[PDB]
Amino acid sequence: GVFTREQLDEYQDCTFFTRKDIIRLYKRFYALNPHKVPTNMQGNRPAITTLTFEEVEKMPELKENPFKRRICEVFSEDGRGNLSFDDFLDMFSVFSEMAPLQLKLKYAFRIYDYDGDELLGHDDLSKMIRSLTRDELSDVEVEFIIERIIEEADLDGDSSINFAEFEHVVSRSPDFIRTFHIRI
Amino acid sequence: GVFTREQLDEYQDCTFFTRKDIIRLYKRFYALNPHKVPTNMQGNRPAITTLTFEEVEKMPELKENPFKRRICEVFSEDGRGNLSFDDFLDMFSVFSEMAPLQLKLKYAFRIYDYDGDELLGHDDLSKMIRSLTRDELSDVEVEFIIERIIEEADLDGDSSINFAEFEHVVSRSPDFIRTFHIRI
Amino acid sequence: TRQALLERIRQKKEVIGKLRCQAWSMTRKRRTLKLAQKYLEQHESKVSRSHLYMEEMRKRARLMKRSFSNFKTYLIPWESKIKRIESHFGSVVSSYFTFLRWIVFVNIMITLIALVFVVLPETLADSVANEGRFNRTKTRKQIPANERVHADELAVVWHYDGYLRYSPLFYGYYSDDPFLGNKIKYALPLAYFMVTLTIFAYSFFAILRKMAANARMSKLSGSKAEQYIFNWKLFTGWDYTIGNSETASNTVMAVVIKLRESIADIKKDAHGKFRLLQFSLRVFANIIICAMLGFSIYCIIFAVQKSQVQDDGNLFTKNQVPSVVSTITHVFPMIFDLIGKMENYHPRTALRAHLGRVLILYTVNYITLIFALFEKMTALRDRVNNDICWETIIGQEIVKLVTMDLIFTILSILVIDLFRGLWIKYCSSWWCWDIETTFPEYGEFKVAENVLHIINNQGMIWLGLFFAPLLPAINNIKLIILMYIRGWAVMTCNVPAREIFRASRSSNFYLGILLIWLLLCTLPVGFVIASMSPSRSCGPFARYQHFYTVVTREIEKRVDQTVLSYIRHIASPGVVIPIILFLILIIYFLFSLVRGLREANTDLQAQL
Amino acid sequence: TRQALLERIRQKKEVIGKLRCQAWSMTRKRRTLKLAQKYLEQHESKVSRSHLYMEEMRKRARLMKRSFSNFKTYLIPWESKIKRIESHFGSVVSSYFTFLRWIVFVNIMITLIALVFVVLPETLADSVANEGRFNRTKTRKQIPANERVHADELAVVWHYDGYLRYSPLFYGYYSDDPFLGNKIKYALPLAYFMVTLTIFAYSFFAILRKMAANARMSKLSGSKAEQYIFNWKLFTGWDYTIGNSETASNTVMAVVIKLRESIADIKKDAHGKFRLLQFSLRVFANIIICAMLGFSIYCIIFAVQKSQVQDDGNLFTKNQVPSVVSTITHVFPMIFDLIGKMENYHPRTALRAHLGRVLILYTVNYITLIFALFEKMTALRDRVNNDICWETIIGQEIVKLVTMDLIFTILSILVIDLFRGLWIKYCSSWWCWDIETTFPEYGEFKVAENVLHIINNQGMIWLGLFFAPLLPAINNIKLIILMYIRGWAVMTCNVPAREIFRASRSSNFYLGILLIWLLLCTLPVGFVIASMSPSRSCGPFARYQHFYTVVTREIEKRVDQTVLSYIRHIASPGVVIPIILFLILIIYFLFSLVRGLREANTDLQAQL
Amino acid sequence: VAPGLRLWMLIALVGGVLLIMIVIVCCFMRIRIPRTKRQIDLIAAK
Amino acid sequence: VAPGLRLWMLIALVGGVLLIMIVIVCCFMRIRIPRTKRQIDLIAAK
Ligand SMILES: CC(C)CCC[C@@H](C)[C@H]1CC[C@H]2[C@@H]3CC=C4C[C@@H](O)CC[C@]4(C)[C@H]3CC[C@]12C
Ligand SMILES: CC(C)CCC[C@@H](C)[C@H]1CC[C@H]2[C@@H]3CC=C4C[C@@H](O)CC[C@]4(C)[C@H]3CC[C@]12C
Ligand SMILES: *[C@@H]1O[C@H](CO)[C@@H](O)[C@H](O)[C@H]1NC(C)=O
Ligand SMILES: *[C@@H]1O[C@H](CO)[C@@H](O)[C@H](O)[C@H]1NC(C)=O
Ligand SMILES: CCCCCCCCCCCC
Ligand SMILES: CCCCCCCCCCCC
Ligand SMILES: [Ca+2]
Ligand SMILES: [Ca+2]
Ligand SMILES: [Ca+2]
Ligand SMILES: [Ca+2]
Ligand SMILES: [Ca+2]
Ligand SMILES: [Ca+2]
């Protein structure tokens, strides 16, 4: 009985995970670091138990992701450099196959920006390109790519993509739901 | 043989009227004023034969139209206060049932503005309302109407309606082609 | 070189084609035409002979099309009449007259189809009929001398008996000879069957083509429309066809009322009210309407049943099925209108409800009459069994129904429009109440009711044209009389409506109703052809056990028996039902696609 | 008061429902949940008893649904295996395994449907069979002592003869008794017919429900998509499921190549080239493909015809129809691939063409085999005429085909994946050419070919389940073996594809193919039920002249004869054809709506 | 002549010629039975 | 025993037990026959 009935009830209302999924996620969280994760966590313990960003990034699911740090930062709480069990649950419930398209779009947009001003500028797109491609494209090549992206995905002529334009553009791609998914 | 073969050939290419329609329109034009309309008009005579705006507005087709003067001004040539046979043909070919929706929309937009700046402002809409309604609406009523028209038919927030917005709004009305039609 | 020449030719052709649809001045249009002509003349000596031949053939085709159009515009009637009606009453009233003119054209085409290949060859064969053919066809083309004395009695004639029964107007007049004669070798039963099928095929094609021209080529952009209340009620608020002072004043008042009520509705936005009296009145009216529908069914069945006589026992009672049905068709609508007074609500949905009730009544009467007629003919044939001619009898019933419908329409026009108008004009001063300023009034043109009358008559014509080949020929005269009398009545007696609404505000609404009626009318003709057996003493199909046998017997004469036995198995019920399932599946797929497109459009509009 | 309470309840319910689908933090979600719970507790004493009862019933329903879901997640197998395959190979390879798991679930449901109502009651009746039932069913449930000695011969067993022919696996095992026994009164023929119909109905329902869930509830906004090349190839350019280093490097290289080729295509925009050699190669390849298709037809027909023996004349040649068809089904695709090398073009359209050719070959083989089998059974029944059991024979052919298909799939997996991989690993150093860096390679997972294999097997199961009730029960074991062996082969022998494309990039592509296959397979079952007559010496329908007679004889026992004669006339061809015409008309209407909506959307996008 | 075999032809011929005369006469004049709203208002006021 | 009526059962039983042993053994080990592209490149260079 790691979690009480009310804890699992709240978890099921908030997330897309059943009791078995919650138990499996807790087992994985404990396996990430047995010393820092208490066995008994009834009450407010989950909100106070934290792991370093590197320790969470060490898991096989996020090991090879170019945007692992961005995912960890986006799904973290106000604390910087620490990820809690609740944030872990939120992260792996957003990426689930049961999550709706709107939530995935919102969190993908939040991941793909870096400054955090709710806009995908030239610098953010360039950083994303050099992260995904692994600096295997020439500077002219990259710049042409951001030029195309900004000119074909902008309606207000702001040279920046807001959340509404990003959703309107990439929600019609049939491969976003298929790709933006982590099984756990 | 009022018109030669080439004159009627050019008329048929330019307009939507067959030879019988051209002859009937010429008969009506002559009946408007027999003295000012020469019986023989082979050559460049149609471009030089003109009638006053009032004489054309005296015909039963345009007699009861609130926008008769606007129609005459829109379809007239560079000359002010005079309407020629070619302009008469253009006018009654635009209003025909065979004219396409795009041409009708263009000329309706050109009619509905007064200053001639390719924009339907508050003043133009107010003038159109007071012309169609015949000053049977209170000033608050009229202003409320233009407020609705501008707010529900504007995309750039210019407080004015351009040709593209006017077409996009009123081309989906099923009663435009039915109403914007003069049989002759 | 070649690519540049092709691009120049395409640009010149596009410019010349679009020259007419351009919002340019006449001088600019002429200048562009001369420039394009000069450019084409310069570019003439640039391509080879094949391109020149192609251009010459295209020019010849365009010139021939223009000449055909110029000739065609000389054969379009009722232009001044429709123009006058439009100028005096509006562009919604004249829609009925344009629809009637198109219906007249379609009926004339059907008449020509059924007259070139059936009536004319048979009449020519009769004119040159030898002794053998005369002997073979005397029993069906000559009135017996016993009955010939009673050929004209004001009741034999009124019932299309006597000389009319042995006329090319009916199915029993045509002969069973496989060939009309020598040196021609014209198969008359095959021509009859193929003409009956071709008339329905052409009707379907014409209705679909008109629908596509009205919607796909004209208002393809009207789909997925929303709001735009003030824009649609202001930018499209004046009828440019109107050229009368009183009608113009009525239009101005109507637009003022429209704007005022739209603003009043948009202002309060409060809808709270519940009165038991109004609900009781509504349910009572909806109950008495169903009671009257059942009473109409009972009256139709009783009238058909009472006409149980085939011999001349009596004729003042046998003619009660055309006088009853027509009566309902012409009297129940107005009663419906009165019931609509009890159910008070939005005039637009009131008109839609009235149209729905009238359509339901018409369809119910149609089905009841068809069932009763078929049952009566089956019972009479069983009782009597040379053999009687049930096809001629059915044709006679349909023709009598059409004639009585025309008579009742003329009487209703005379009573409601002329006499009521005269009574209002000459009796409003000293009446008990002011009829001129009260409900009676002078009268308004009911566009939807009259269009439904036209559609019902056309449905009768479609149903009865197999048993009466010359039914559309008579319907042509009926439609011409109807057009003239309706024009006179609307011009002389009716006044413009203060505010006229539309049931759907769509161009293909009445055309859709007409297509539905065509399907409903091709159902029983198909059943008759597939199931019932021809008479052995009349008609061209008297030598076969089925109506379609004349076609299959020729198909089997050119197709091997093994492949025939293989193809007959596709008609199995267990193969047909999966086809229905597949059609339902693709309908579901298209419906889901339409719903998804609509949802996407609404979401895009809401977001942006 | 009441309106405010209703608004508060609606707001609380909406907030609680949307709490999970909100991009909020966990602390914010918990705070909102507690606030909503406190507000609901405060508002509890605001409404009457009826609202409290409604809320209680809704809460009970939600709790029961949650408990059922929690129990259901404990019975979902193959999660770790699919997760490992996804992490090692990607999210496009694992789509095949998820599809296979769903197919396994559907087949298990079909097995339960056909086992609860048919196999189990018949087995229980057999266990308690009295002297009368034993005497009545000895001729079909007991192997004759003449043949019992040869019940196991490695050829009688391999052909499902002997003990398997008299097993509940086949149609001829079931008895003709209208009632299973006393105190139960279970109608077995009616259960058989209704279970056969219900399996097809449930298959249709499940496929349609899965399609709706995948499209309407998930990607309803994907309709009317355009351009967005760089956006779709950059924002959706990384697979988040991948967790392997080599696969990650392959994905990086693939995305780099995709971007480079897209930019190269968009830069030049010049397409001018015409080589006669390429056109000749393309037409030659498209000709040899048709030649091979005709050769496949000829081979299938020859193999079926040579199996003209019903008695045990020989068995090493009678088993050539399962060995031939399977061979084609497993050998022609790869040959197709080789021909695709001659026709060099865009890899995406190359894959689409390969899928089209494979689908055409599968459908052609299906139709040829069905026609040949039906003709052979008809000829054998005519020649032999107690009477033979053609349903049991057809079931035996289908079961043997399925078993040989599984054997050939296992052999192909062993040869192409395991042995070829070992040969490449241990023979690339001293080969004539570098096989590791040349065409041979190690092997890539063909998702589309394997999914088509699954669909073809399911089509065989659907076709043959009427004659073999326990065919889906065997197919369950076949599918489990297939899943395990495919997982092992992909994990141990295959390497990730350098760049993997998709034929349609749509979720409901393979589901649409499955629905089409279901219709194609319900065509001949429907023909058999409607047309063919049951055997007089085997099965539960041996007392009737038709398969459906067991249903009609019960319908006619509860419906009057007059209304029955009235309803039978709707099945007339002349009434059925107008229904087809009406369905075609509404299909045309919906297609015109779709085209108009697409045109309007394109015009709006171009203008704005 | 005949009461049941010839009177109806005479009646029909008389009706037909009368209807032809009525149609020809009514094709040369422009009867307008209803009165305009202005006349109605003027009558009501007086 | 019998050459046509008993040998095939013995062969099938031997094959079945051998297949069961192979499946059980292969369910406890993680063979990976192919080599990574890095190893292929290293071999090609040397
Ligand atoms: C739209 C129009 C053209 C349709 C008219 C109906 C057509 C289909 C009918 C009417 C006349 C018919 C033809 C009349 C006479 C003959 C000669 C006979 O030995 C063979 C059939 C043949 C050749 C008939 C074929 C069908 C036919 C052509
Ligand atoms: C999805 C599942 C429930 C479908 C199973 C098939 C159904 C339709 C079948 C299977 C068993 C059948 C019943 C078996 C026994 C009897 C008793 C008999 O005197 C009347 C028919 C009746 C009542 C049958 C009606 C049809 C039936 C209910
Ligand atoms: C026509 O039929 C009559 C029947 O009596 C017969 O007498 C006469 O000879 C026939 N004439 C022909 C064959 O035209
Ligand atoms: C069963 O059938 C056999 C046929 O010979 C008969 O002898 C025996 O009496 C029967 N027993 C019953 C009725 O169970
Ligand atoms: C008012 C115009 C009258 C001239 C046209 C009359 C045509 C009548 C017959 C039309 C159908 C053939
Ligand atoms: C890899 C997971 C193995 C546990 C699940 C095994 C289930 C096998 C039977 C599934 C269909 C009933
Ligand atoms: Ca930014
Ligand atoms: Ca922007
Ligand atoms: Ca302006
Ligand atoms: Ca604007
Ligand atoms: Ca009528
Ligand atoms: Ca397989």
Q: Is D178 helix (H, G, I), strand (E, B) or coil?
A: coil
Residue B168, chain D, CB below 8 Å: the answer is yes
How many A from CA of C553 to the centre of ligand 1? 15
Residue C302 lies in a domain: no
Q: Is C127 helix (H, G, I), strand (E, B) or coil?
A: helix
Q: Are B118 and B124 in contact (CB under 8 A)?
A: no
Q: Which residue of C has its CA nearest to D582?
A: C519
Residue D67, chain F, CB below 8 Å: the answer is no
Count Cα atoms within 13 angstroms, Cβ side, for C568: 11
User: Residue type for E40, please?
Assistant: I
Angstrom distance (rounded) from CA D126 to CA D134: 8
Substitution target in D590, D598, D604 with the highest count of C β-carbons within 10 Å is: D590
Q: Are A43 and A61 in contact (CB under 8 A)?
A: no
Q: What total number of domains does chain C contain?
A: 3
Q: For residue B153, which residues of chain D lie inside 8 Å, CB to CB?
A: none
A86-99 as b/e: b if 16+ CB within 10 A: bbbbbbbbbbbeeb
Angstrom distance (rounded) from CA D196 to CA D539: 14
Residue D156 lies in a domain: no
Angstrom distance (rounded) from CA D125 to CA D178: 12
Angstrom distance (rounded) from CA B61 to CA B75: 15
Angstrom distance (rounded) from CA D163 to CA D156: 9
H, E, C per residue of chain A: CCCCHHHHHHHHHHCCCCHHHHHHHHHHHHHHCCCCCCCCCCCCHHHHCEEEHHHHHCCHHHHCCCCHHHHHHHHCCCCCCEEEHHHHHHHHHHCCCCCCHHHHHHHHHHHHCCCCCCCECHHHHHHHHHHHCCCCCCHHHHHHHHHHHHHHCCCCCCCCECHHHHHHHHCCCCCHHHHCCCCC
Q: Are C323 and C404 in contact (CB under 8 A)?
A: yes
Dihedral pair phi/psi, residue D601, rounded to 5°: -65, -45
Residue C126 lies in a domain: no
How do strand A50-52 and strand A82-84 relate by DSSP bridges? antiparallel
How do strand A50-52 and strand B82-84 relate by DSSP bridges? unpaired
Residue D305 lies in a domain: no
Same domain (yes/no): C98, C247: yes
The Cβ of residue B1 has, within 10 Å, a number of other Cβ atoms equal to 8
Is A117 among the annotated ligand-binding positions?
yes
Q: Which residue of D has its CA nearest to F26?
A: D488
Q: How far is CA C89 from CA C94, C246, C413, in A?
A: 8, 10, 18
Contacts of A118 (CB under 8 A, 6+ apart): A162, A163
Question: For residue C444, what is the enclosing H or E element?
Answer: none
Which residues 290-319 in chain C show a CB within 8 A of chain B? none
Same domain (yes/no): C495, C600: no
Angstrom distance (rounded) from CA D225 to CA D228: 8
A43-78 as b/e: b if 16+ CB within 10 A: eeebbebbbebeebbebebbebbbbbebbbbbbbbe
Same domain (yes/no): C410, C542: yes
The Cβ of residue D383 has, within 10 Å, a number of other Cβ atoms equal to 10
Angstrom distance (rounded) from CA D153 to CA D158: 8
Nearest to F33 among D152, D436, D493 (CB): D493
Q: Do D74 and A177 touch (CB under 8 A)?
A: no
Angstrom distance (rounded) from CA D52 to CA B93: 71
Dihedral pair phi/psi, residue C98, rounded to 5°: -65, -40
Contacts of C276 (CB under 8 A, 6+ apart): none
Residue C3, chain B, CB below 8 Å: the answer is no
Supply the DSSP string of D46-95, one letter for each residue. Answer: GS-HHHHHHHHHHHHHHHHHHHHHHHHGGG---HHHHHHHHHHH-TTHHH
Same domain (yes/no): C68, C97: no
Supply the DSSP string of D117-176, one letter for each residue. Answer: IIIHHHHHHHHT--HHHHHHHHHHHS--HHHHTTS-SSSTTTTT-TTTTTSTTSGGGS--
Contacting subunits of D (3+ beta carbon pairs below 8 A): A, B, C, F
Angstrom distance (rounded) from CA D278 to CA B77: 61
What are residue A83's DSSP bridge partners?
A51
Q: Is D26 helix (H, G, I), strand (E, B) or coil?
A: helix
Ligand 3 pocket test target in C131, C134, C135, C138 with most atoms within 8 Å of CB: C135
Dihedral pair phi/psi, residue D507, rounded to 5°: -70, -40
Q: Are C604 and D600 in contact (CB under 8 A)?
A: no
Residue B172: name the closest of B101, B98, B96, B95 by CA.
B101
Residue F1 lies in a domain: no
Residue C3, chain D, CB below 8 Å: the answer is no
**CA trace torsion D454, D458, D459, D465 (10° rounding):** 160
Angstrom distance (rounded) from CA C79 to CA B184: 9
Residues having CB closer than 6 A to ligand 1 are C 117, 185-187, 190-191, 194-195, 198
How many A from CA of D390 to the centre of ligand 2? 26
Q: Is the dihedral of CA B78, B83, B84, B85 positive or negative?
A: positive
Q: Tokens standing for D240? A: 């988040």
User: Residue type for C91, please?
Assistant: S
Residue E3, chain C, CB below 8 Å: the answer is no
The nearest CA of chain C is from the CA of E20 a distance in Å of 13
Q: At what angle do helices D320-342 and D447-464 cross, to 10 degrees?
A: 150
Angstrom distance (rounded) from CA A128 to CA A121: 11
Angstrom distance (rounded) from CA D16 to CA D34: 10
Angstrom distance (rounded) from CA D284 to CA D280: 6
Residue C520: name the closest of C575, C579, C459 by CA.
C459
User: Which residue in the block uniquely carries the two structure tokens 């008809």?
Assistant: D378
Angstrom distance (rounded) from CA D255 to CA A154: 23
As a whole number of angstroms, the longest Cα–Cα distance in chain A is 58
User: Residue type for D269, please?
Assistant: D
Residue C105 Cβ contacting ligand 5 at under 6 Å: no
Q: Tokens standing for D284? A: 């030659």
Q: Tokens standing for D245? A: 């280093």
Q: End-to-end distance of chain D based on CA atoms, in angstroms?
A: 48
Question: For residue D573, what is the enclosing H or E element?
Answer: helix D573-607
Angstrom distance (rounded) from CA C303 to CA C322: 9
User: Which residue in the block uniquely carries the two structure tokens 């015909």?
Assistant: B59
Q: Are C574 and D531 in contact (CB under 8 A)?
A: yes
Q: Is D288 helix (H, G, I), strand (E, B) or coil?
A: helix
Q: Tokens standing for C109? A: 């085409």
Contacting subunits of F (3+ beta carbon pairs below 8 A): D
Residue C567, chain D, CB below 8 Å: the answer is no
Angstrom distance (rounded) from CA D48 to CA D52: 7
Q: Are C285 and C343 in contact (CB under 8 A)?
A: yes
Q: Is B120 helix (H, G, I), strand (E, B) or coil?
A: strand
Angstrom distance (rounded) from CA D96 to CA C92: 60
What are residue B84's DSSP bridge partners?
B50
Question: For residue B50, what is the enclosing H or E element?
Answer: strand B50-52
Q: For residue D424, which residues of chain F lie inside 8 Å, CB to CB?
A: 34
Phi-psi region of D495 (alpha: psi -120 to 50; beta: other; left: phi over 0): beta
Same domain (yes/no): D241, D252: yes
In this complex, whether C and D touch, counting 3 or more CB pairs under 8 angstroms, is: yes
Angstrom distance (rounded) from CA C464 to CA C472: 9
CA B107 remoteness from chain centre: 6
Q: What is the domain range of residue C579?
A: 566-608
Angstrom distance (rounded) from CA D204 to CA D194: 15
Which residues 239-268 in chain C show a CB within 8 A of chain B? 239-245, 247-248, 252-253, 255-256, 259-260, 263
Q: Which ligand is nearest to the CA of B152?
A: 10
Angstrom distance (rounded) from CA F4 to CA B182: 99
Same domain (yes/no): D487, D470: yes
Residue F37 lies in a domain: yes
Question: For residue C89, what is the enclosing H or E element?
Answer: helix C79-89
The Cβ of residue F20 has, within 10 Å, a number of other Cβ atoms equal to 10
Q: What is the domain range of residue F20?
A: 7-45
Q: Are D442 and D493 in contact (CB under 8 A)?
A: yes
User: Residue type for A33, please?
Assistant: N
Q: For residue C517, which residues of chain D lie inside 8 Å, CB to CB?
A: none
Angstrom distance (rounded) from CA C595 to CA D216: 9
Residue D88: name the closest of D245, D231, D222, D225 by CA.
D245
Same domain (yes/no): C599, C468: no
The Cβ of residue B37 has, within 10 Å, a number of other Cβ atoms equal to 18
User: Which residue in the block uniquely carries the two structure tokens 């045309």?
Assistant: D588
How many A from CA of D356 to the centre of ligand 12? 19
Q: Tokens standing for D573? A: 């061809």
Q: Are D225 and A169 in contact (CB under 8 A)?
A: no
Q: Are D467 and D394 in contact (CB under 8 A)?
A: yes
Residue D195 Cβ contacting ligand 2 at under 6 Å: yes
The residue nearest atom 10 of ligand 6, judged by CA position, is D77
Residue C239 lies in a domain: yes
Angstrom distance (rounded) from CA D571 to CA D578: 12
Dihedral pair phi/psi, residue B84, rounded to 5°: -100, 175
Nearest to C442 among E8, E34, E44 (CB): E34
Same domain (yes/no): C84, C193: yes
Q: Tokens standing for D600? A: 């309007």
Angstrom distance (rounded) from CA C531 to CA C525: 10
Q: How far is CA D53 from CA A167, B76, C251, D65, in A?
A: 42, 76, 57, 18
Dihedral pair phi/psi, residue A82, rounded to 5°: -130, 140
Residue D181 lies in a domain: no
What are residue B82's DSSP bridge partners?
B52
Residue B101, chain D, CB below 8 Å: the answer is no
Contacts of B112 (CB under 8 A, 6+ apart): B67, B70, B120, B124, B128, B166, C235
Residue D568: name the closest of D579, D559, D581 by CA.
D559
What's the burial of D361, exposed, middle or buried (CB within 10 Å: 0-12/13-18/19+)? buried
What sections of C307-419 are H helices per DSSP? 320-342, 347-384, 390-412
User: Residue type for D55, please?
Assistant: E
Contacts of C432 (CB under 8 A, 6+ apart): none
What are residue B120's DSSP bridge partners?
B161
Contacts of D204 (CB under 8 A, 6+ apart): D515, D518
Same domain (yes/no): D470, D523: yes
Q: What total number of domains does chain E contain?
A: 1
Count Cα atoms within 13 angstroms, Cβ side, for B89: 30
Q: Is C534 helix (H, G, I), strand (E, B) or coil?
A: coil
The nearest CA of chain C is from the CA of E36 a distance in Å of 7
What are residue A120's DSSP bridge partners?
A161
Q: At what angle do helices D2-18 and D49-72 cross, to 10 degrees?
A: 10
Q: How far is CA C421 from CA B163, C407, C415, C495, D480, in A?
A: 48, 20, 9, 10, 87
Phi-psi region of B119 (alpha: psi -120 to 50; beta: other; left: phi over 0): beta
Contacts 24+ apart (CB under 8 A), D410-418: D410/D481, D410/D485, D412/D330, D413/D485, D413/D486, D413/D489, D416/D443, D417/D443, D417/D489, D417/D492, D417/D493, D417/D494, D418/D489, D418/D492, D418/D493, D418/F33
Q: Which residue of B has its CA nearest to C22?
A: B103
Residue D186 Cβ contacting ligand 2 at under 6 Å: yes
Angstrom distance (rounded) from CA D222 to CA D218: 9
Q: How far is CA C49 from CA C21, C36, C44, in A?
A: 32, 21, 10
Same domain (yes/no): C432, C530: yes
Angstrom distance (rounded) from CA C390 to CA C388: 6
The nearest CA of chain D is from the CA of F20 a distance in Å of 13
Q: Is B83 helix (H, G, I), strand (E, B) or coil?
A: strand
Question: For residue B52, what is the enclosing H or E element?
Answer: strand B50-52
What's the burial of B131, exposed, middle or buried (CB within 10 Å: 0-12/13-18/19+)? middle
Angstrom distance (rounded) from CA C32 to CA F8: 94
Angstrom distance (rounded) from CA A170 to CA A163: 11
Method: cryo-EM
Same domain (yes/no): D21, D99: no
Question: For residue D566, what is the enclosing H or E element?
Answer: helix D561-568
Is B135 among the annotated ligand-binding positions?
no
Residue D563, chain B, CB below 8 Å: the answer is no
Q: Do F40 and D437 touch (CB under 8 A)?
A: yes
Q: For residue E32, which residues of chain C lie inside 8 Å, CB to CB?
A: 491-492
Q: Is B84 helix (H, G, I), strand (E, B) or coil?
A: strand
Phi-psi region of C148 (alpha: psi -120 to 50; beta: other; left: phi over 0): alpha
Same domain (yes/no): C494, C473: yes
Q: Are D358 and D336 in contact (CB under 8 A)?
A: yes
Q: Are B176 and C237 in contact (CB under 8 A)?
A: no
For residue D569, give the DSSP letter.
G
Q: Which residue of E has its CA nearest to C250?
A: E37
The nearest CA of chain A is from the CA of D561 a distance in Å of 55
Residue A168, chain C, CB below 8 Å: the answer is yes
